[PDB]
Amino acid sequence: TGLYTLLSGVNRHSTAIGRVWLSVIFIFRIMVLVVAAESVWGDEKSSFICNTLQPGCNSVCYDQFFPISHVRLWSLQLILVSTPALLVAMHVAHQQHIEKKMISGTLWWTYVISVVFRLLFEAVFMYVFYLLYPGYAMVRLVKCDVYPCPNTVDCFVSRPTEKTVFTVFMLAASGICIILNVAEVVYLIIRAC
């Protein structure tokens, strides 16, 4: 869990919000993603079927309706969100090594910049999820007319309801993280002056 708290962005300049609340939500998202990765999204493509005899229609319809899986989007979001925290940690380690082999304002500015970047990454991933999948709910039946499928064919999705439940969980966690990051930057600015 120490690696997770390091990836969250815990810093010596962090207040209570960034040290005890943001890290817990980060670990919660990690755990939910680990639980839901291969259990429920494992057979997303192998169980995807369409009512047709046309060869190759299943693959093209699946690619049309799922350009990128939800789990991969969440994994990329977590990696990109955790990147600035470890960047700051490596910078701190470099500064301490330089001190050993031989100010606070630089640390403060680095922390606020990293928090802003985390907020930006979370916001852009929320926006791209909204673009790709406008509704939080997943439907049982989809209509596909991509070549080489003739006319329009019916295709059926695996586990729509469980995927909807996990999507709601993940979106709520991301929204809470965005709100907490905004509160963190506002609190730091207020404490500055």
Nearer to its own copies (CB atom), residue 99 or residue 147: 147
Least Å from the CB of residue 10 to its own copies: 58
Beta carbons within 10 angstroms of residue 121's beta carbon: 20
User: Footprint of its own copies on residues 148-167 (CB under 8 A)?
Assistant: 148, 150
Size of the site for its own copies (CB under 8 A): 5
Q: Which CA distances in Å does 124 have to 95, 162, 169?
A: 31, 25, 18
Binding mask 131-150 for its own copies (x = CB under 8 A): -----------------x-x
Residue 144 beta carbon to its own copies: minimum distance, rounded to whole angstroms: 17
Select 2 or 55, whichever has its Cβ closest to its own copies: 55
192 binding its own copies? (CB under 8 A): no
Buried b (16+ CB within 10 A) or exposed e, 91-109: eeeeeeeeeeeeeeeebee
Q: Does 69 help bind its own copies (rule: CB under 8 A)?
A: no
CB distance 32 to 169 below 8 Å: yes
Q: Give the residue with the Cβ less far from its own copies, 55 or 105.
A: 55
Distance (Å, rounded) from C-alpha 158 to C-alpha 15?
A: 43
Six-digit token pair at 39?
A: 């259990």
Give the contact letters, 10-49, x = binds to its own copies (CB under 8 A), - = no: ----------------------------------------
Identify which range of 50-58, 68-76, 94-102, 104-112 contacts its own copies by CB under 8 A: 50-58
Kindly tell me which residue out of 3, 53, 102, 103 binds its own copies, with binding defined by CB under 8 A.
53
Q: How far is the CB of 130 from its own copies (least distance, A)?
A: 38
Choice from 39, 46, 47, 54 touching its own copies (CB under 8 A): 54
The sign of the torsion formed by the CA atoms of 126, 129, 130, 136 equals: negative
Q: Which of 183, 14, 2 is nearest to 110 (CA)?
A: 14
Pairwise CA distance, residues 104 & 95, whole Å:
11
C-beta neighbour count of 84 within 10 angstroms = 20
Give the footprint of its own copies on this chain (CB under 8 A). Answer: 53-55, 148, 150
